[PDB]
Amino acid sequence: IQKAIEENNNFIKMAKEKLAQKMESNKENREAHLAAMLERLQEKDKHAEEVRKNKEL
Amino acid sequence: RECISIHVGQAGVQIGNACWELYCLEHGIQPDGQMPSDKTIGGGDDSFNTFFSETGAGKHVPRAVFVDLEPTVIDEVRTGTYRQLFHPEQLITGKEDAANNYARGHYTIGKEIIDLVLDRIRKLADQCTGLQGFLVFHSFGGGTGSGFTSLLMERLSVDYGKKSKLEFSIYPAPQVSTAVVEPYNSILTTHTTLEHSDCAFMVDNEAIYDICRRNLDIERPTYTNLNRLISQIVSSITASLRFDGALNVDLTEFQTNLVPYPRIHFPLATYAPVISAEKAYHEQLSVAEITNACFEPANQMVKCDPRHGKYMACCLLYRGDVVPKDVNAAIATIKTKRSIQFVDWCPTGFKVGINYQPPTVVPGGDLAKVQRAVCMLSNTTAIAEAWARLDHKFDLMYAKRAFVHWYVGEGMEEGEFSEAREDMAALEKDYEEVGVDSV
Amino acid sequence: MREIVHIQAGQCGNQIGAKFWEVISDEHGIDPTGSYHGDSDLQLERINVYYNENKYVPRAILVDLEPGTMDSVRSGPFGQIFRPDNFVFGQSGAGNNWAKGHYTEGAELVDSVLDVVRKESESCDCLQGFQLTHSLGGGTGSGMGTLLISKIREEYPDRIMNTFSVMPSPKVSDTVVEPYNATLSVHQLVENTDETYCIDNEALYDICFRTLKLTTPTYGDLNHLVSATMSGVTTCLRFPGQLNADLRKLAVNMVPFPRLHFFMPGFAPLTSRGSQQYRALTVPELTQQMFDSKNMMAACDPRHGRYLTVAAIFRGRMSMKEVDEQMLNVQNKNSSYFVEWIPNNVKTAVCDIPPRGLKMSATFIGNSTAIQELFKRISEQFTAMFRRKAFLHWYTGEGMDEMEFTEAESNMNDLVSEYQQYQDATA
Ligand SMILES: *[C@@H]1CC(=O)C/C(C)=C\C=C\C(=O)O[C@H]([C@H](O)NC(=O)/C=C\C=C\C)C/C(C)=C/[C@@H]2CSC[C@H](C1)O2
Ligand SMILES: Nc1nc2c(ncn2[C@@H]2O[C@H](COP(=O)(O)OP(=O)(O)OP(=O)(O)O)[C@@H](O)[C@H]2O)c(=O)[nH]1
Ligand SMILES: Nc1nc2c(ncn2[C@@H]2O[C@H](COP(=O)(O)OP(=O)(O)O)[C@@H](O)[C@H]2O)c(=O)[nH]1
Ligand SMILES: [Ca+2]
Ligand SMILES: [Mg+2]
Ligand SMILES: [Mg+2]
């Protein structure tokens, strides 16, 4: 009976932990995809600044 | 010994609608939840109380949660015929769906609603005096049915431990599919769910579509046609839980015989008779007829050929005017005549249950009302053919990483695709290995 | 419930945008004052996708760097339906110069456009994304339109960005810098939109002239075709249905690799009134015509490439069984032209409401590698100019550098090679 309790508990534990690790990895990945996208868009705004500066000469 | 039904995404919800309507007709429950034949007001321990709780005002309320990531399918339940049967809190919706993307169902959108769905299931569990387990209805192909189901099944293993979880899973077909990525979603959810499910009944949309066209003469079946048939099959399977009788045999006892190894948990369901009113008229379809129809591959709920694999179990679930004498004679005939090879390590006996309550049909349906019906549940190595078909479609697209960016964009990695596909290869190999003869 | 915000920019963009609104308002039973006077509940069920709410007001923003087109929109049919504060216009014009739209004049106006975008967005129950109508061959739609795309994307980075992008042709405009403005715009679209309908003035002209026998097609004639198509390709978004019912589901079904998001739209029927005396309007006719080069709104022959993905929408009363049968037949007889490594890559929807004045119609959305023919045509006109540095001063005088031209050209050539790669890939 102790063995059966232990293995049920260990199953819960491992399922809990695996899920926590996937939801964190997923979150960091999604965030990074978004941050990269926004950084490209910001490079473009900086480039448009330079164009308008280049025009002023 | 309560069972809680969970209906996830469009397919799971619409099949739930059909199932709960049929259950109400089978038990004599009105759309307002009243049941004049139940004389214990506000409670009791009848067989039908496995699926329905009771309020003091006499309402019989499904032990069910419906969840979807967008509202428009559940809104039909909320405003339709059976709207008074459910408490508002049992019908849960978000505003934006998973867009046919497992990653959105399991992560981006799913995570915003999972806590609330678990809360609501807990409130159902808290009213049960001996909860036996869950029945979870979902597509393979949709983003919610795949990804939210997966998330939910992982979360239920944590919160309920090894309490029983069974699935009714809708396997995709091209004639009614809505996404090119359905193979990906199917493989991802099959992988994620596999260690969390005790028993899963796959329903191939193409098998049902074909049965509707061929046996009911429906030219172009709709979900409504499909779901009415599916509900009869579901009903046959759960009838052992919701009715009693001397020859009724509980679903869990069939389960014992159906599941020889944890991963080998996918029974093939075959149902008969599927016939129209016009053909059923003046034709009485005997126990022998309906039983022999279960060994016709055309009546199976998953396209595959059992004649080219091996059986590890065969269960017959009869309903209606059926006595063991007629059953035994029918099985005896079939054994002399059909392609039924067992693996060498199983008994070859058929396991039989009989519920006396005759089958019911819903008004305006396609199915004739009949005196006796049967659902065969077999464990055959042939069901692996369904995995091979999906696996192949997965391989074609994955080799070019077609559509994978949609998943990666939502935070997934390629490694999750190859892990899922590797597990499916192992599963296919498990099905080969169990059919090989003992040395 | 799931709102789309529509932006129309520049002359072309406002002209086709106004016809879109006239045609879908008629389909949904909305009159020029915004009152509902239709006969079917199908018309109202998803009205919120395109209209705010006893009046219905397009979720539409009208943008230009000069007033004239927007003045005629306002006095046109359905012109009082638009919200007055949603007209945002300057006085300068853009001079058919992308750099003026994108970097100078357009930049001076864009923040005031964004103010209105935000106001529309913020009162959405759950915004799906944006649709833009514009030309690529002018200055405002092309330069300012692509600027708005990038600015909106910064503030709504997880929403879908869809365009209806009108590609130039020497058969319709003789403005000599159109290939420059279009190449610079495609450069932006490749990177920053999720889904682009390539509406090619070459094809609209050839349909008008060769099929419909109009000797001298007007913009009006061209726009009538565009409005048919735009109605068709938005049918699944605004009427109840299963397939491609929102922008993101459409993208997931249609876009297997992020850059390959340029669709060939097509419409059926397209038969002259005189040939109509001979040829019945039936499901097999629609199906045959919708897969024919002559019915495509981009001037590309799909038999010169392969289909990655296809969406087919039928409209009107017809047999679902006959639709399924014809759609299977057309796939079987054309099997070579559908890549084998995307199984089941054609999806089919049916909506019971036909376009005005037809018993039935069909609309095609193809993601075909043959779209390379359109980019190649633009690319050949671009290089004939750029090799000689012709007309560059109009762009460098706004502060641009030659390097940006080299980079836009290379990106568009790279798009062409990528379509070729997937065309030649096998299972
Ligand atoms: C078009 C409104 C308008 O001003 C022009 C008029 C009055 C009619 C135009 C009809 C037309 O362009 O029809 C084409 C096509 O020629 N029709 C057929 O091929 C019909 C039958 C063929 C049988 C074999 C179709 C078309 C582009 C119609 C669109 C639909 S969206 C509403 C516009 C309005 O018309
Ligand atoms: N039998 C049956 N299949 C259905 C039904 N509705 C959808 N399907 C199938 O389910 C798959 C699509 O998944 P859906 O359940 O619609 O998707 P969802 O779970 O709502 O997920 P998203 O909409 O992506 O959030 C396809 O294979 C459809 O054929 C239905 O009521 N009955
Ligand atoms: N189909 C179509 N093309 C148009 C229309 N008006 C202009 N164009 C095309 O759009 C391009 C010119 O850009 P335009 O929209 O006029 O300039 P803008 O006002 O600076 O955005 C050319 O390729 C024209 O042929 C119109 O109403 N319909
Ligand atoms: Ca009772
Ligand atoms: Mg859904
Ligand atoms: Mg102009």
Using CA positions, which residue lies closest to atom 5 of ligand 3? C12
User: Residue B161 and residue B148: Cα distance in Å, rounded?
Assistant: 19
Q: How many CA atoms lie within 13 A of C317 on its CB side?
A: 1
Number of helices and strands in chain C (H, E): 15, 12
- HEC string of C139-204? CHHHHHHHHHHHHHHHHCCCCEEEEEEEECCCCCCCCCCHHHHHHHHHHHHHHHCCEEEEEEHHHH
- Cβ count within 10 A of residue C138: 31
Q: What is the token pair recorded at A17?
A: 């932990």
Give the three-state DSSP class for B95. Answer: coil
Residue recorded with tokens 């999604």: A30
User: Residue B422 and residue C359: Cα distance in Å, rounded?
Assistant: 51
Contact B121, B65 (CB under 8 A): yes
Nearest to B370 by CA among B298, B243, B277: B277
Q: Which one of B162, B408, B412 has the shortest CB-CB distance to A11?
A: B162
In CATH terms, the superfamily for domain C2-256 is Tubulin/FtsZ, GTPase domain (3.40.50.1440)
Give the three-state DSSP class for C97. Answer: coil
Which ligand has an atom closest to residue C9 CA? 3
The dihedrals phi and psi of B33, each to the nearest 5 degrees, come to: 85, -10
Q: Give CA torsion, residues C68, C74, C78, C83, to 10 deg.
A: 130
User: Residue B292 and residue C372: Cα distance in Å, rounded?
Assistant: 58
- Using the mean position of ligand 3's atoms as its centre, give its distance from the Cα of residue C381 in Å: 18
Written as one letter, the residue type at C213 is K
- Contacts of residue C321 in chain B, CB cutoff 8 Å? 219-220
Nearest to C140 by CA among C192, C105, C111: C105
Nearest to B205 by CA among B184, B221, B188: B221
User: Residue C282 and residue B187: Cα distance in Å, rounded?
Assistant: 40
Catalytic residue among B253, B283, B413, B422: B253
| Distance (Å) from the alpha carbon of A50 to chain C's nearest alpha carbon | 8
Q: How many CA atoms lie within 13 A of C345 on its CB side?
A: 26
Written as one letter, the residue type at C68 is G
User: Residue C295 and residue C206: Cα distance in Å, rounded?
Assistant: 10
Architecture of the domain delimited by B268-382: 2-Layer Sandwich (3.30)
User: Residue B187 and residue B299: Cα distance in Å, rounded?
Assistant: 25
Cβ neighbors of B45 (< 8 A, separation 6 or more) are none
Q: What is the token pair recorded at B71?
A: 């509202």
The dihedrals phi and psi of C309, each to the nearest 5 degrees, come to: -155, 155
Cβ neighbors of C270 (< 8 A, separation 6 or more) are C207, C211, C212, C289, C294, C295
User: Residue A30 and residue B412: Cα distance in Å, rounded?
Assistant: 8
In angstroms, this model's resolution equals 2.0
Q: Give CA torsion, residues B373, B169, B180, C254, to 10 deg.
A: 120
Residue recorded with tokens 């990895």: A25
- Using the mean position of ligand 4's atoms as its centre, give its distance from the Cα of residue B61 in Å: 11
Classify domain C371-427 at the CATH class level: mainly alpha
- Using the mean position of ligand 4's atoms as its centre, give its distance from the Cα of residue B41 in Å: 5
Nearest to B292 by CA among B253, B323, B264, B333: B333
Return the DSSP state at B358: P
Give the three-state DSSP class for B406. Answer: helix
* Cβ of residue C305 lying under 6 Å from some atom of ligand 3: no
Which of C100, C111, C147, C153 is best to mutate for the A interface (most A CBs within 10 A)? C153
Q: What is the token pair recorded at C66?
A: 């000069």
Strands B199-204 and B164-171: parallel
User: Residue B154 and residue B152: Cα distance in Å, rounded?
Assistant: 5
Contact B416, B188 (CB under 8 A): yes
How far, in Å, are C115, C155, C353, C411 from residue C191 at the CA level? 24, 16, 36, 9
Using most ligand atoms within 8 A of CB, pick from C270, C285, C288, C290 the residue to mutate for ligand 1.
C270
Angle at C249 between CA C339 and CA C230, to 5 degrees: 85
**Residue B355, strand partner residues:** B319
Q: Give CA torsion, residues B404, B409, B412, B418, to 10 deg.
A: 20
Nearest to C189 by CA among C135, C262, C139, C256: C262
Q: What is the token pair recorded at B190?
A: 């099959």
> Could A12 and B411 be called an inter-chain contact, meaning their C-beta atoms sit closer than 8 Å?
no
| Distance (Å) from the alpha carbon of C396 to chain A's nearest alpha carbon | 8
Distance of CA B383 to the CA centre of its chain: 15
User: Residue B296 and residue C191: Cα distance in Å, rounded?
Assistant: 55
Contact C49, C237 (CB under 8 A): yes
Residues 1-57 of A with CB under 8 A from B: 8, 11-12, 15-16, 18-19, 23, 25-31, 33
The helix (run of H) or strand (run of E) holding residue B3 is strand B3-8
* Cβ of residue B150 lying under 6 Å from some atom of ligand 2: no
* Residues within 6 Å of ligand 1 by CB: C 23, 224-225, 228, 231, 269-271, 276, 279, 281, 285, 355-358
User: Residue C98 and residue B66: Cα distance in Å, rounded?
Assistant: 52
Residue recorded with tokens 């980075």: C157
Q: Does A36 touch chain C (CB under 8 A)?
A: no
**Residue B300, strand partner residues:** B270
Q: End-to-end alpha-carbon separation of chain A, Å?
A: 85
User: Residue B235 and residue B399: Cα distance in Å, rounded?
Assistant: 41
User: Residue C306 and residue C341: Cα distance in Å, rounded?
Assistant: 12
Q: What is the token pair recorded at B397?
A: 């697209």
Domain limits, chain B:
1-267, 268-382, 383-439
- Using the mean position of ligand 5's atoms as its centre, give its distance from the Cα of residue B135 in Å: 20
Domain limits, chain C:
2-256, 257-370, 371-427
Nearest to B50 by CA among B132, B147, B140: B132
- Contacts of residue B411 in chain A, CB cutoff 8 Å? 25-31, 33
> Could C399 and A37 be called an inter-chain contact, meaning their C-beta atoms sit closer than 8 Å?
no
- Using the mean position of ligand 2's atoms as its centre, give its distance from the Cα of residue B145 in Å: 7
> Could A15 and B157 be called an inter-chain contact, meaning their C-beta atoms sit closer than 8 Å?
yes
Written as one letter, the residue type at C120 is E
Written as one letter, the residue type at C373 is E
Residues of B forming the annotated binding site for Mg(2+)? 70
- Radius of gyration in angstroms for the set of CA atoms belonging to chain B, rounded to a whole number: 21
User: Residue C164 and residue C186: Cα distance in Å, rounded?
Assistant: 12
> In terms of residues, how long is chain A?
57
Residue B33 Ramachandran class (φ > 0 left, ψ -120 to 50 alpha, else beta): left
Q: Which one of B100, B401, B403 has the shortest CB-CB distance to C249?
A: B100
User: Residue A32 and residue C292: Cα distance in Å, rounded?
Assistant: 43
Number of helices and strands in chain A (H, E): 1, 0
DSSP B265-316: --PEEEEE---BHHHHTT----HHHHHHHTT-GGGBSS---GGGS-EEEEEE
User: Residue B308 and residue C346: Cα distance in Å, rounded?
Assistant: 32
Fold of B1-267: Rossmann fold (3.40.50)
Using CA positions, which residue lies closest to atom 22 of ligand 3? C137
- Find the largest Cα–Cα distance for chain B: 64
Experimental method: X-ray
**Residue C163, strand partner residues:** C132, C196
User: Residue C309 and residue C165: Cα distance in Å, rounded?
Assistant: 20
* CATH number of B383-439, picked from 3.90.1150.10, 3.40.640.10, 1.10.287.600, 3.40.50.620: 1.10.287.600
Contact B310, B264 (CB under 8 A): no
Residues followed by a gap in chain C, C→N > 2.5 Å: 53
The helix (run of H) or strand (run of E) holding residue C62 is strand C60-64
Q: End-to-end alpha-carbon separation of chain C, Å?
A: 41
- HEC string of B390-431? HHHHHHHHHCCCCCHHHHHCCCCCHHHHHHHHHHHHHHHHHH
Q: Is the preceding omega at residue B273 within 30 degrees of 0, hence cis?
A: yes
Which ligand has an atom closest to residue C363 CA? 1
In CATH terms, the superfamily for domain C257-370 is Tubulin/FtsZ, C-terminal domain (3.30.1330.20)
Q: What is the token pair recorded at C124?
A: 């959405």
User: Residue B255 and residue B241: Cα distance in Å, rounded?
Assistant: 13
User: Residue C88 and residue C13: Cα distance in Å, rounded?
Assistant: 14
Using CA positions, which residue lies closest to atom 27 of ligand 3? C12
B2 included as an active-site residue = no
